[PDB]
Write a protein that binds this ligand. Structure first.
Ligand SMILES: Nc1nc2c(ncn2[C@@H]2O[C@H](COP(=O)(O)OP(=O)(O)O)[C@@H](O)[C@H]2O)c(=O)[nH]1
Ligand SMILES: Nc1nc2c(ncn2[C@@H]2O[C@H](COP(=O)(O)OP(=O)(O)O)[C@@H](O)[C@H]2O)c(=O)[nH]1
Ligand SMILES: *SCCNC(=O)C1CCN(C(=O)COc2ccc(Cl)cc2Cl)CC1
Ligand SMILES: *SCCNC(=O)C1CCN(C(=O)COc2ccc(Cl)cc2Cl)CC1
Ligand SMILES: [Ca+2]
Ligand SMILES: [Ca+2]
Ligand SMILES: [Ca+2]
Ligand SMILES: [Ca+2]
Lengths: 167, 168
C-alpha cells in the first residue's frame, strides 16, 4: 500500500492538535500541551484504496529552524489551518505557504486550506474570503470543527486525494 | 539597450486599448475598435535605465487559439487588466493567468494586476479583494484610469521592473 507523510500547519491555537487527535483517537482535547510536536499513524481507506498516513502535528517557536525545513522537505502534503474567529491566523496562511514553497522549491505542493472552529457563532474571516484564497492557490477549502468532528475526516481525506493527484 | 515583449490581457471592455494608447500616444480613446489587435514600440526610461518595449494589445474571441498561445510563449511580461466596475472581469483574471502559466510551463511569469477605470464611482470590486488576489499571486497591484491617465505609466513601468527582477 501507499504511505503518505502529512503535515498540519497553522498559527498557535487554531486547532492543529485538536483536529489531529480527533482523527486519530476520536476525542476532543481542550488543553493539549502547546509544545508537543509529534507524529501519529493511521491506516485509512479513501475512495476504495488503502493508505498509511503519517501525520505530523507541528509545534515550535516563531523562528527559522533547519529541523522544520526537514519536516517540510519530507512532508508530502500540508493542511493549512486557520481559525474562523482569528483574522491574523488567516492572514498568516500566506506566510506559511511561502515557507513550504521555499523549502520544497515548488509551487505545486499538495495542500488543503482548513477553516477550523466552524461551530463558533461568530467569525471574523468570511467564507467567501477563504474560498477565494483557496481558489487563488489552486487548492481545496474545507470547513471543520474539531469540537463536533464536523469535516475532520474530510479535511485529511481531501489532502490524501491531493497527494494522489500530484503523484 | 534591452528589449522586452509585453502583453496586455484582460476581458472585453476593461480598457486594454485605452491604456496602451494613453501610454504610446498620450490621449484617451472612447470607442476603440474591439477587433484591432496590434503592437506598439516605445523607448522608455525606468529607474534610470532605458528599455525598448514591444507592447501587444490583445483582441480575439473567447476560444482556444494556437496563435494566442504563441503570443504567450514569446511574451516576457503580462498586464492582467480588470475594470473595477466589472466583477466578471476580475473573476476572469484567474483564468487568464492559468492560460499564461499553461503555455509557459508554469514559469514564474512577470505579471502585474491592474485595476482600471479607477475614476468611476461605480465600483463593484473592492480594492481589498484585488490587493489580496495580487498578494496570493505574488505580484504587484496598480490602480489606473486610462481616462485621467492616473497610474498608466506606473502600470507599465512596474511590469518592466518585474521583468528585470525575473531576468536577473
Ligand atoms: N470551539 C472550538 N474550539 C476549538 C476547536 N478546535 C480547537 N479548539 C480550541 O482551541 C484551543 C487550541 O487548540 P489546539 O488544538 O491545542 O491548537 P494548536 O495550538 O493549533 O495545536 C483548544 O483549547 C481547543 O479547545 C473547534 O473546532 N472549536
Ligand atoms: N471611465 C473610464 N472608461 C474607460 C477607461 N478605460 C477604458 N474606458 C472605456 O471603456 C471602454 C472599453 O475600452 P477599451 O480600451 O476599448 O477596452 P478593451 O476592449 O479592453 O480594449 C471604452 O468605452 C473606453 O473609452 C477608464 O479608465 N475610465
Ligand atoms: S501554540 C505555541 C506554539 N506556536 C507555534 O507552533 C507557531 C510557530 C510558528 N508557526 C509556523 O511556523 C507555521 O508554519 C509551519 C510550521 C511547521 C512546518 Cl513543518 C511548516 C510550516 Cl509552513 C505557527 C505556529
Ligand atoms: S472586446 C471583444 C474581444 N474579446 C476579447 O478580446 C476577449 C477574448 C478572450 N480573452 C482572453 O483570452 C484573455 O486572456 C489572454 C488573451 C491574450 C493572451 Cl496573449 C493571453 C491571455 Cl491569458 C479576454 C478578451
Ligand atoms: Ca498543538
Ligand atoms: Ca492545485
Ligand atoms: Ca481593444
Ligand atoms: Ca512574484
Amino acid at each position: 500500500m501507499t504511505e503518505y507523510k502529512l503535515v498540519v500547519v497553522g498559527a498557535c491555537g487554531v486547532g492543529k492538535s485538536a483536529l489531529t487527535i480527533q482523527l486519530i483517537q476520536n476525542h476532543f482535547v481542550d488543553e493539549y500541551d502547546p509544545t508537543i510536536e509529534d507524529s501519529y499513524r493511521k491506516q485509512v481507506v479513501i475512495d476504495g484504496e488503502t493508505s498509511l498516513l503519517d501525520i505530523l502535528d507541528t509545534a515550535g517557536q516563531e523562528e527559522y529552524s533547519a529541523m522544520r525545513d526537514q519536516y517540510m522537505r519530507t512532508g508530502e502534503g500540508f493542511l493549512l489551518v486557520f481559525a474562523i474567529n482569528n483574522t491574523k491566523s488567516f492572514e498568516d496562511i500566506h506566510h506559511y505557504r511561502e515557507q513550504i514553497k521555499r523549502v520544497k522549491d515548488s509551487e505545486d505542493v499538495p495542500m488543503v486550506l482548513v477553516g477550523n472552529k466552524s461551530d463558533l457563532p461568530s467569525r471574523t474571516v468570511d467564507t467567501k474570503q477563504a474560498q477565494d484564497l483557496a481558489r487563488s492557490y489552486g487548492i481545496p477549502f474545507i470547513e471543520t470543527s474539531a469540537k463536533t468532528r464536523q469535516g475532520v475526516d474530510d479535511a485529511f481525506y481531501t489532502l490524501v486525494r491531493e497527494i494522489r493527484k500530484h503523484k
